[PDB]
Amino acid sequence: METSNFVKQLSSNNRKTRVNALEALKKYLTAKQFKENKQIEFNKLWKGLYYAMWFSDRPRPQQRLANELGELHGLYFDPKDNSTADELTTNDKAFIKFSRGFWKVMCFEWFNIDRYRLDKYLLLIRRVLFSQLKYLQSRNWDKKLVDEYIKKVLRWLPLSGSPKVYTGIPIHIVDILLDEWERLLKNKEEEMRKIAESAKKTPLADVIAIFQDIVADYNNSKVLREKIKEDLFSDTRLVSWDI
Amino acid sequence: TVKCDNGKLYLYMKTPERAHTPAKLWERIKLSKNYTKALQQIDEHLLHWSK
Amino acid sequence: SRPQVTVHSLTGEATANALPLPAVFSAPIRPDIVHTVFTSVNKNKRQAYAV
Amino acid sequence: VKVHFDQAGKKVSRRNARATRAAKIAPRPLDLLRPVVRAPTVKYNRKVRAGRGFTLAEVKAAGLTAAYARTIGIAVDHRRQNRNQEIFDANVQRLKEYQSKIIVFP
Amino acid sequence: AEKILTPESQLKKSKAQQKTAEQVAAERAARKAANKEKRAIILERNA
Amino acid sequence: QVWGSETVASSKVGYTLPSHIISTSDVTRIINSSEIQSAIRPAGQATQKRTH
Amino acid sequence: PKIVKKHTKKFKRHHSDRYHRVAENWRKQKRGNISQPKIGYGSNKKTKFLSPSGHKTFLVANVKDLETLTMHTKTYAAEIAHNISAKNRVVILARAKALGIKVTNPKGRLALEA
Amino acid sequence: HRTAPKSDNVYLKLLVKLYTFLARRTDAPFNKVVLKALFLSKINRPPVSVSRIARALKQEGAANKTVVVVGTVTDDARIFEFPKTTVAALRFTAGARAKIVKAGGECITLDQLAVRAPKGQNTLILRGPRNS
RNA sequence: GGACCAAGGAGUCUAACGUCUAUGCGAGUGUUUGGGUGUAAAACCCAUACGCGUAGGUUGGGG
RNA sequence: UGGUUCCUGCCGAA
Incomplete structure (x- = not known):
């Protein structure tokens, strides 16, 4: 109801409509009823956000708007939910x-x-x-x-290795991923060991096994397999992180 | 595009973001009268831009 | 390829309503076929002449 | 040797006829009430068609005379013969529906 | 104020150019010694 | 109403808005995308170095 | 560069002087003392379309056409079309000298009074 | 024969530019075959029935291959059962397009084909049976 | 074959089969006899018919 | 029987 209107407001030629709609979504996502909605409403909302990005003029508003979309995932964390139980919550399922x-x-x-x-x-x-x-x-x-x-x-869509997924998206994944873990971790050798310890806190060694599976399947594309094998598997940071 | 309106020279920028709305298409920047400074301004506004 | 287009007033300004594209604008543009059809259509309103 | 240059023109003239005749016939349709008639010739015997006129006996079964029915705009053929039941009945229903929809000025 | 960050396409082409330049420079450095050995062998053979 | 869509029918008898043989209108986008740029050998000087 | 021309003269029809009804354009006949046109006389591709000044000519009708030669001044040279009225030719000349473009034909339909 | 398409379809010339960048910059003979097939005339591009495609999918080891048709994929109602596979081509008749989609498969354009298999990994190319 | 010169002056159109090529659709295809429409010999829409077509193995072998 | 209208390039017999 309101969701399709939010899609139309984000897919507006007016800039201020899109800005004010995004500010309203900041209030809207922290609500029960949107968490109640099925995945189709999430899909419509994401295509609205896509066209909301699609009009961003200069690269500094582009960076601001991308940071705002990062804050959108930042909305669905409650500090209570980490404290209560190891099991999932409905906020997490909505995430x-x-x-x-x-x-x-x-x-x-x-x-x-x-x-x-x-x-x-x-x-x-x-x-x-x-x-x-x-x-x-x-x-x-x-x-x-x-x-x-x-x-x-x-494992569902991007790291599936399916031909339905375009190759450049997991190539972009294996580009950014190593830098993203280092972003999570934050002279240089003390920095390295702090990075090492804090990386051993992380379960990433499970995540790289997905890429191992990706290289293992021979029906997968040899290009993406080969670039993972060349770039990711020859990283020095995995050796420093015992991977 | 470097282009002059009556006296002052302006850098005109065109983005794919404004493919529609051609009245609001061109962005204007006033160039400096210092030749060196204005070339520096060109290199600034065309940062990460093609050769 | 944007979803929708803002309608404009007779006074001329962005009316708050907007309309989705009719997807006809996503058609292939084939100027060869437009040319070959255009020649034959331009040959339609012709009156004959003779000696 | 002849070329139909007037193919565009005559149609216009014909619709002028279809205008002008209609002007004189202002409430009434241009065409009469024709029968729905199944075709001969085994290539076409599954096809139904517009016929010329109904018959005397069918118009009597509709409940009026053919001499009066020509004034009502119902095309009547004497030399046709009604030999199929369903043709006859469907055309009787057609006549009844035509009777239902007319209003006649005294 | 906020720093304009390099577009990622430039970063991918940058990584590719760096790897390519290292491969070409290493190969040319091998070529120099190999061509030296060729010249010595040809000196010997013509003697 | 006049031309139809994938949602609205056509209003023309047995007409369909016709398809593309290529989906992406930009070829240089496809060439410079990432993955063709992964699969491709390194390029030349883009003008030939004249020898001899 | 050094412009080679490969043929100074013109290519005339055989027996073109012998009759007044016969033109001087090249028409193929269907001794060897007549120079016949052929692709060997085709000029060098760098040197082709060059004035003795060393420019490539460009016809200019008005000021908007003159502004298209703004960047390529040293390569091209503007030539005013034959049918330009004398009010417009002086405007074109002033604009061209402002742009610093060599006009091939100045002083056409014009004089300098006082 | 032809070193260029004698057609003037703009999108076709776009695919020619794309596959000539591939056939220069790849080492697989695949893109060279695709380039040579793009030049072919309408007679030299005979249509491929989807029945012939399914009969081709009856080959051993081909079920996880993708199929490529330089030409038109046409329908045939003489088949009932059609497997879930991936077909890339130039043109799709709406009957054959509905056969591929209705069988859960996928109707692919050749640009997406180049994106999926730049070296022609794991493919099939079918040619229509020319008689005249 | 020629006194000279000017202008004019000679593979056009149509019909029937045939190859090739391009284009649209595709086992289908073909609006324009005709009807509806119109800013009116244009464009636009199209009912019923009709026309033409449709109704295993081995060896290799592009890849 | 006689005549049969622009250029250049490429291929080019009996």
């Missing part, structure tokens, strides 16, 4: 449907983006991975959330 609709809409609308239009969506995906991993760190990697965020999000 799962939220991020899941994000990657669905993004992998759909990926191939229509202009080469001039591309880099703001690239930085968007960078901020979104930062935000979702920040949600994981806020929950401090509860195993329910970790497993379901692997399966229903990452």
Whole structure:
């Protein structure tokens, strides 16, 4: 009801309509009834956010708007939910449907983006991975959330290796991912050991096994397999993080 | 595009973001009268831009 | 490829209503076919002449 | 050798006829009330068609005379013969529906 | 105020250019010694 | 109403708004995307160095 | 560069002087003392379309056409069209000398009084 | 023969530019085959029935291959059962397009095909049976 | 074959099969006899018919 | 029977 109106307001030619609608979404996402809604409403909301990004003129508003979309994932964390139980909450399931609709809409609308239009969506995906991993760190990697965020999000669409997914999206994943973990961790050698310890706090060694599975399947594309094997598997940071 | 209106020279910027609305299409920047400073301004506003 | 277009008043300003694209604008643009059809259509309103 | 240059023109003239005749016939339709009639010739015997006129006996079964029915705009053929039941009945229903929808000025 | 950050396409092309330049420079450094050995062998063979 | 869509029918008898043979209108976007740019050998000087 | 021309003269039809009805354009006949046109006389591709000044000519009708030669001043040279009225030719000349573009034909339909 | 498409479809020339960038910058013979197939005439691009496609999918080891048709994929109602597979081509008749979608498969354009298989990994190319 | 010169002056149109190419659709395809419409010999829409077509193995072998 | 209207390039017999 209000959701499709939010989509229309975000997909407006007027800038101020889109700004005020986004500020209203900041109040709207922290609500019960949107958490009650199925994934189709999340999908509509993400395509509205996509066209909300699509009019962002200068690169500093692009960076601001990408940071705001990071804050959108930052909304669905309550400090109570980390304290109460290791099991999932309904806020967390709404976050799962939220991020899941994000990657669905993004992998759909990926191939229509202009080469001039591309880099703001690239930085968007960078901020979104930062935000979702920040949600994981806020929950401090509860195993329910970790497993379901692997399966229903990452193993579901982007890291599936399916031909339905375009190759450039996991290539962009294996570009940003190493830098994103280091963003989570924050002379140089003390920095290295703090990074090492704080990285051993993290369950990332499970996450790299998805890429191991991706390289293992031979029906997968040899390009993405080969680039993961060349870039990611030859990283020095994994050796410093015992991976 | 460097382009002059009656006296002052303006840098005109065109973004794909404003493919629609061609009245609001061109962005205008007043260039400095210092030749060096205005070339520096060009290199600033065309940062991460093609050669 | 934007979703919708702001209607404009007779006084001329962004009316708050907007309309989605009719998806006809997503059609393929084939100027060869437009040319070949245009020649034959322009040959329609012709009166004959003779000696 | 002849070329139909007037194909665009004559149609216009014909609709002028279809205008002008209609002017004189202002409430009434231009065409009469024709029968729905199944075609001969086994290639076409599943096809139904517009016929010329009904018959005397059918118009009597409709409940009026053909001499009066020509004034009502119902085309009547004497030399046709009604030999199929369903053709006859469907055309009787057609006549009844035509009777239902007319209003006649005294 | 806020720093304009490099577009990611430039970063990917940057990584590719750096890896490519290292491969070409390493190969050319091998070529120099190899061409030296060729010149010595050809000196020997023509003697 | 006049031309239809994938949602509205056509209002023309048996007409469909016709399809594309290529989905993305920009070829240079596809060429410079990421993954073609992964799969491709390094390029030349883009003008030939004349030797001899 | 150094413009080679490969043929100074013109290419005339055989027996073109012998009759007044026969033109001087090249028409293929269907001794060898007549120079016949062929692709060997085609000029060098860098040197092609160059004035003795060393520019490429460009016809200019009005000021908007003159402004198209703004960047390529040293390569091209503006030539005023034959049918430009004398009010417009002086405006074109003032604009061109402001732009610093060599006009191939100044002083056409014009004089300098006082 | 032809070193260029004699057609003037703009989108076709776009695909020619894309596959000539591939056929220069790849080492697989695949894109060279695709480039040579793009030049072909309408007679030299005979249509491929979806029945012939399914009969081709009856080959061993082909069920996880993708199929590529430089030409038109046409429908045939003489088949009932059509497998869930991925077909890339130039043109799709709406009957054959509904056959592929209705079988859960996928109707692909050749740009998306180049994106999925730049080196032609795991593919099939089918040619229509020319008689005249 | 020629006194000279000017202008004019000679593979056009149509019909029937045929190849090739391009284009649209595709086992279908073909609006324009005709009707509706119109800013009116244009464009736009199209009912019923009709026309033409449709109704295993081995060896290799592009990849 | 006689005549049969612009250029250049490429291929080019009996």
